[PDB]
Amino acid sequence: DQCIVDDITYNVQDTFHKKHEEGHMLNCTCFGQGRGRWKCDPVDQCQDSETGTFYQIGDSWEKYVHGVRYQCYCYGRGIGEWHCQPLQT
């Protein structure tokens, strides 16, 4: 048995990643089990409040808020924890 997801074929016991339509990342598993069954879980990741954009652990991004430019970073730590800092030289 196999799994078919987005025109991709996986073997039973295969694991892979997949981007949800909403934009967040998933970790997935192919079970097959007669019907090519597969499941995907929301990965530990960060979601920007303003932009609603998703960032992965280790990712860094910038944003302008009230004319101030920040560098942001996704720590995750099991709670999609992320922090930002004002640009400095």
């Binding site: 799994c3 078919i4 997801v5 997949k18 949800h20 909403e22 967040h24 998933l26 997935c28 019907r35 090519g36 069954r37 597969w38 499941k39 995907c40 879980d41 929301p42």
Partner: peptide
């Protein structure tokens, strides 16, 4: 919580 996904032939 964020949604996951599941699938299988005949879905």
């Amino acid at each position: 919580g964020l949604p996951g996904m599941k699938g299988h032939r005949g879905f």
